[PDB]
Symmetry: D3
Subunit: 168 residues, 6 copies
Amino acid sequence: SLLNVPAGKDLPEDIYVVIEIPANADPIKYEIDKESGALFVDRFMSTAMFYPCNYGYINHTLSLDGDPVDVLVPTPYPLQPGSVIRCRPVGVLKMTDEDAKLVAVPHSKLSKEYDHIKDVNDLPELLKAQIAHFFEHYKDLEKWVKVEGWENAEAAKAEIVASFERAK
Amino acid sequence: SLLNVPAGKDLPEDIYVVIEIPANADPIKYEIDKESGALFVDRFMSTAMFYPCNYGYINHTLSLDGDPVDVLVPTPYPLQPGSVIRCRPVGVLKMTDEDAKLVAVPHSKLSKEYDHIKDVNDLPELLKAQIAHFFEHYKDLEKWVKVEGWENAEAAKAEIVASFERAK
Amino acid sequence: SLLNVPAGKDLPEDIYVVIEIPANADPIKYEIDKESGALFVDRFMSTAMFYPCNYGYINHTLSLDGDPVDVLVPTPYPLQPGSVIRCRPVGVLKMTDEAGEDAKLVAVPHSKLSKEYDHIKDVNDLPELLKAQIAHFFEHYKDLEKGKWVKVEGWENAEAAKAEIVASFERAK
Amino acid sequence: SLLNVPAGKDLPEDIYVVIEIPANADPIKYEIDKESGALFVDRFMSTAMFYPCNYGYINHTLSLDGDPVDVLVPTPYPLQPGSVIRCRPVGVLKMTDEAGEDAKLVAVPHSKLSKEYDHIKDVNDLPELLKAQIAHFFEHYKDLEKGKWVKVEGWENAEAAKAEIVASFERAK
Amino acid sequence: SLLNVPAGKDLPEDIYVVIEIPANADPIKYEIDKESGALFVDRFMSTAMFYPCNYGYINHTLSLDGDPVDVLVPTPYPLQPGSVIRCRPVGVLKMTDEDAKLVAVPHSKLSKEYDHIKDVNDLPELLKAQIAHFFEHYKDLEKWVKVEGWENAEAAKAEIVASFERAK
Amino acid sequence: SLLNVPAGKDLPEDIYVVIEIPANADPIKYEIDKESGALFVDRFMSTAMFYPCNYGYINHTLSLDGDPVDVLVPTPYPLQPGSVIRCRPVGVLKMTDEAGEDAKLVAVPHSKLSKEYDHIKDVNDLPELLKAQIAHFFEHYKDLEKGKWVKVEGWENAEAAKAEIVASFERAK
Ligand SMILES: [Mg+2]
Ligand SMILES: [Mg+2]
Ligand SMILES: [Mg+2]
Ligand SMILES: [Mg+2]
Ligand SMILES: [Mg+2]
Ligand SMILES: [Mg+2]
Ligand SMILES: [Mg+2]
Ligand SMILES: [Mg+2]
Ligand SMILES: [Mg+2]
């Protein structure tokens, strides 16, 4: 089951992200039920918006807000909900609703299209702008958010370590 | 696994439906293998028809025909096969092939678009007509069905209780 | 060609809307080129949003913004860009952008194409959620565009909508 | 424009079919408007069915029902509404509806677009399942329409199909 | 879980194939992680090619190359990744990278559209040509393959028996 | 009609490309018929491949192969066949097939439709992977066609691309 997926091959550099929401999909917010490991429908988003990246989490992590570390992962093609992808963290969007969303890109073994993206600054400015705007507005018709800013790979990695250790 | 999903938060008012067939999809009839909990292909439908609603069942229920209680769940967007959705029952299409198909709509927490639908009579007449016609004709090129009529929330709820208790 | 499509069967009650952008599609803003009648890519939207309804225009109309009357049309399923749909107007979303005033009509499929909308006779009959999504979209789809802004001002009834159609049709003559 | 598309390269063996509805699509019945050549939404089908094949017509043909010859064309993948495909006729589904008689031709992609259909020379070569689905669809797609009914009467060969094409082409002159 | 799916109802005649890659899909190569049974992203294919058939494996089999027996399964419609389909083997494409890919078609109970295909020779020549060409070229932009030839149902069945027994 | 679409706003820097085949689509090779302007199905590709980019042409151009200049255009999302996109050329893939010489231009969306490509000024700025996929595709998409072969010869810069456009435009006059 998805419940048995490890946090990564080598934390915080090499991680696995369990995808819950594909990039560019219908506005259905799914979530893996932590008890069953099954894909539950969390809610039908009320805004006409879509996640600009595949969205999911790192298993075996516990942040402050209670859940696992949530990650956005850009890919050439939308991924299947419930699928697991190997990535390396490169940044973190910090916001207040405080919450942190990491940005991880596919591991070199899955694709070479991202090798050049080592840090938050290497991410296409538009994409960063879209992620922010999305997080800043998807819940408008409901819960609110306030994007504070981006942080580097180090801070993204620190969040992973802290949450994994905190999960233990 | 899907095998561990509960019948609902509060039977028969608040239930979880394990989706096997998405609304408006290619004519592939999937079914969750009860032993493995895996999605098996039951058959490739022979008619050029598609389920007008997402189709699935309530876990931990056993009707007479042997299976779990089967449910149709309208949603704004097609759901993923194997996904689980929280709903509240509102009616039942009774037919003879006797079989009963409940109609459940998304729980208020997932969407407010259905709050006004409390009973079978609140369902759009077209949709009810489509569900009937579909059930009445999808197996024409194979097994036959004869739609007898709709029943209220109470009867739909009674079917859930009877099947859950019968499952115990 | 799309350029020859009439404004409607009986304006302003019965109109045709030329679809340029389907509902729930990828963020590509298409626009029918006025001279060729061909579907041009106006731009790739910068926000992660999608039109909540099919969006197009009534041909042979000229609003004061120099363009045809814009119309949003909800349909059970997304339509093909470049297709024409028979509708009857039911409301208008009034707004102000960086250029000035703008209005978007909301029209529903005519009774002969579908009965599902027969009960929607006016702006008030539209699901509140739908109205909310349309407003939120227009209010935010251009947020990532330097120098562009939208201020939704409110909705207006069928009568106001029909008024826009006649004025613009006459104005286009 | 689609209005200028020829009936075919060499009628009735080699024809072009203007596609209006793709195979396995959402239940939206499109129709090319005869005067504009534009794709109009004829209606949103009320049943949970979809055309088992791409459906369109041969341009410049006039059958006695006042419309062009209707043709169903199976293809490996669904075609774009408004596209034209070169086919060769292989059969005709004869039926009677509430208005009277109707016939739908079944044509397959010409050998130059694909070799996959070279072995389908006549109505009997079509997979029985495909023939069954087409009949069932026409027999049931209008079930939720008050006052509409279809009674499939049977299939006919390539020769009968080609006969329909020539008669209607000549008839359209 | 998918890990508990049996090899088939009756080996080597009646088997179950666990689908990992749907036919005609985006070039994402998924694979079921053998430890968790979860769908992992193996890699984003670099060529602009797509599997001409649904691709997966027979569970509880171990070939030489180490994995389970991999199967291509033509269907009227693309199948869901992680879904299981009942088929009967009809041929095997042998190649060297040595590797063997079986071709199985849906079991008669799921569809009758394939009853007439009993052996490798009954498969549409184009499809066989497409499978070969695909296998011969998908890894060009990376690992190489050399299609050697097709073999009959018997050889396909022999491969299943050998791998199942070898898996024990 | 598509036949009336101009070659561009300011050739060879600013051009329009009429899309015939979208990126990452089913293997159906569409082609705009030169006389009708309608989208014809040229053929169903025999290989399990798909165009890595949207593919079309610049109207009003005539290369020595007797056809308009072919252009591949990467876009964030696949475009509708028959739509026109404003681009600026950045390179050309030179190749030789069974008929002789051929060249495919690579153009990117103009700055006004999207800023995402502003940094792509020349063939060298294109992602190497993209260049590799395009070459591999043209080199293999016709492998299952008896008597057809492609030999990619190399890439050339913006200048060479712009040269192709002017020569062909002038040549089409
Ligand atoms: Mg959090
Ligand atoms: Mg039952
Ligand atoms: Mg979308
Ligand atoms: Mg305006
Ligand atoms: Mg469908
Ligand atoms: Mg007729
Ligand atoms: Mg192997
Ligand atoms: Mg594809
Ligand atoms: Mg050329």
